Design a protein around this nucleic acid. Structure first.
Lengths: 331, 73, 323, 329
DNA sequence: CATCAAGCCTTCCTTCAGGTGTTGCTCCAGAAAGGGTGT
DNA sequence: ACACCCTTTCTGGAGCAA
């Protein structure tokens, strides 16, 4: 089953790339040493072979959300919105290992090297949730394959293929957003501002005195840590139309129905990260099932046999498969 | 040897998921419930064997026409 | 819960963008070198994708207030207007570290590399203020999600939803506003204007000769600079979002929104730059704002009323307590 | 017969390499001991000889998919999309020896070593599927050579030969993708989050105290149960680049060419070399050349009528009896 | 209804933040002996 | 009764580069 979810982020996208990146105040990424630089936390970037100029494929940077992040977003969406309410409305409860296996593929960091029986493998791949995300102590193949969230851009034209010339994007799609943390105690202004503080003016003056001592120590170092922190993070600019490729090799109809229910409940979900700055908010503007567009304003339109299958399976959903899926053979 | 020698890993694994699907569907008549990567049909074996880029030189007494015919084949 | 606080700024909005940007005496932003240049401190702006050629969408600038700035504004009006009167009214006094953890995210720049207990996580995410704003030494996630203040503009037409198109403004929304600082010794002009000056005439003469020696060869008070601002009267929008909130947390947000009328947005405090009025507040798509404040949402106001009653310092103390 | 498939990986390619490779928090691969390092599992790279920038040849890293991986991918595509529907639709069934022989070339069905006369060797090498791969207990040589999936790259030129100077990728084709596993008990944030868990807040706090005890024990030991929090890396071949793939046939029947063509017709639903949960290895076929004649279109493979008709009559006569007699006797 | 005026100077940024913690992999790549029991 | 299947059982070393 081929599912293609074209979304539109209405907030910036921030999937933080690991690394030690810096930036000048003017906006130059990774400056040579000597000039003053601030920590930059770049967004996640996929190198893509693309056609720059004419017939000259080259590796260009295109900033994305990883398929692991979107796979866990899909997993936690169908978990918080479908699977957990189905378990709550009945008497079924999960162990902490079963909850850990359902949310992160495993209960412990150490798997057991023995694989499970063919009957249990077949029944877990027939399961609506466990078939999508087959983890556990004995590693199963989950039939859900989740691609990265690619922005519909020229740099991904060898990724996107034909049919994506509408709402086209060129050029840079990222922006460095600067964030500052000020010291609260420097923003104290009067005795009315300080009355909620134990000690008041004495404690405030002690905070200024420790900041002056630490500043003198840092000046002796240059020529603990305070609360001033001016820094930067690169985000992907809002308003982009993104492609999200979801694949299912011979799924049970309830499993693709569960993916459809999760895509229905992607409303009020954040894609990558930067929670407190409301980053990752998005609007789905299209879902195509095997190339057939099945999205409307009121969620998924059509595809009814998937929804009846997943409703019947959620009615038949229990905690027994989750418990014996997470049960280690070595334990 | 035009290059330094390297080592190639190759593995033999029978598809466990496809085996379970064929075993429920009846297309695989396997009475066994549990596989074994240790030994058997589902033994996921690993084997490492050397790899060299080289130029191969040999010396022999034979008609050139037949040798070039075989080596062009 | 999805709140849309659509506001209109009375005065020019100035959130100072980082960078050594420059301006000529005309309206040329960042000129080529070799011409007379002045330091320009531009407004904070966000690139947004917008339909510019009626088929082609492109990354265009749009001057905003950052969601960090508006989040700290909401946090500070909650603290100085709701939380601190409830704390000093009941006699509760936070520690200096607890005050720093209330106004910033924590008290120290080094967070603890341990996770807190689930009982603690549940108590603070059920707490109104600490549930809205996480952080601390052990990296709590708040339930509040604060977007940037976006102007209702055709550059943001892919950013806003529906219903904003009749209000959507086109064209440029900024101004280079010029400021200057005199050396006020040059503005003295009289021998009875130096009787307040110690030394008097000889002191003013020494300041003049020091300025002349500095100009012949420390920085004086003569400054001429510029800052780009968003134009006043612009209609904005503010997307506050709530990840599974308690009704007390929503009531704390609405209590903050009721009394942001005397609060300033971003920078320009001496120029009264941050002044604004709230045109509307949509509470999950339903309008709850009027002239007197937020009407309706009564369960949220009652929940934050019973939550502000019994608000203790010890929750902030063991939120700020390191490990 | 020399079938040659030009493909483009829509998603990244991650054919995992052996060894204990490590990377810092930046892109420095295999640092010296004494600096924080993370487990990186790299793509399948092989050192190849190339003459680029000089007349002499040098060792350059070329990130490829192994010919074993492509050979078994073609075999599993053949089985899953052609052979298993054909054996199912007539009600034929496979024993474990025949299944292992057909799906893995594996000899454990008859590990004694099956003697094979030259006549049955000829009939088995003329079988549509058995003759392609062979092996099993009879240890038969297949008609099919499957080359490695070689990227169209300047490091691959001596492999590729002429005819690939245009659309030729240059520079690095890899990028390290960072993946982490989060402990989800740390993400329990409310009573509604833990209400599904048996024990609830008590079990959640027990998990937290176990995590703190394990972290304190690890910190004391560094001066054996592993937690769910992991931060690792995997180096992938970047998506969107062009690869070539050579499948040579050593004197085939037309049914065998038709079977390879039918496998390539249904191959875009398959994945090249792992990375399965991250949808890695999804690709489109840009071209198929049968002895240099470009034969692929958007609607699969046009032309090649004799091969498709021969494999149609082969599949109409495809039973499991040939598979069971190829495995056992 | 024609020119003559058809600027001049000088400002032309200042300090500071200029990251913190964690993660820092897991497992298995055997074949026979000795029991059952299912066709 | 002879075929496949499901279990145990069992001997040794140890350093490590890109």
């Amino acid at each position: 089953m081929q599912i293609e979810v074209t979304v539109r982020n209405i907030t910036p996208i921030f999937s933080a790339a690991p690394g030690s990146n810096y930036i000048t105040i003017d906006g130059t990424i990774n400056p040579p040493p000597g000039v003053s630089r601030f920590p930059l936390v770049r967004t996640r970037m996929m190198y893509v072979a693309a056609d720059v100029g004419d017939g000259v494929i080259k590796s260009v940077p295109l900033q994305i959300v990883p398929g692991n992040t979107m796979r866990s977003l899909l997993r936690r969406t169908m978990l918080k919105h479908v699977i957990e309410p189905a378990l709550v409305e009945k008497g079924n409860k999960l162990s902490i290992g079963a909850y850990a296996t359902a949310y992160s593929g495993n209960a412990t960091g150490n798997p057991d090297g023995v694989p499970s029986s063919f009957d249990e493998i077949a029944t877990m791949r027939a399961h609506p949730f466990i078939g999508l995300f087959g983890g556990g102590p004995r590693m199963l193949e989950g039939r859900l394959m989740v691609d990265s969230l690619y922005p519909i851009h020229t740099n991904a034209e060898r990724i996107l293929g034909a049919g994506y010339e509408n709402e086209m994007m060129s050029g840079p799609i990222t922006q460095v957003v600067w964030a500052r943390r000020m010291d609260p105690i420097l923003n104290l202004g009067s005795s009315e501002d300080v009355e909620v503080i134990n000690g008041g003016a004495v404690a405030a003056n002690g905070w200024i005195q420790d900041l002056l001592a630490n500043s003198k120590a840092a000046a002796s170092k240059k020529k603990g840590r305070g609360l001033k922190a001016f820094n930067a993070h690169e985000v992907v600019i809002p308003g982009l139309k993104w492609v999200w490729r979801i694949s299912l090799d011979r799924p049970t109809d309830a499993q693709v129905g569960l993916v459809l229910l999760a895509l229905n409940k992607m409303t009020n979900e954040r894609i990558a990260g930067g929670h407190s700055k409301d980053y990752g908010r998005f609007v789905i503007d299209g879902v195509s099932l095997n190339g057939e567009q099945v999205w409307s304003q009121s969620g998924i339109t059509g595809g009814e046999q998937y929804f009846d299958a997943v409703a019947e399976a959620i009615d038949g959903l229990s905690s027994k498969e989750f418990e014996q899926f997470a049960q280690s053979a070595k334990e | 040897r035009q290059l330094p020698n390297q080592m190639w890993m190759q593995t033999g694994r029978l598809s466990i998921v496809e085996a379970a699907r064929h075993r429920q569907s009846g297309y695989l008549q396997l009475r066994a419930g549990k596989p074994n990567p240790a030994g058997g049909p589902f033994k996921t074996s690993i084997y490492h064997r050397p790899i060299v880029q080289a130029e191969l030189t040999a010396f022999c007494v034979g008609d050139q026409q037949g040798i070039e015919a075989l080596l062009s084949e």
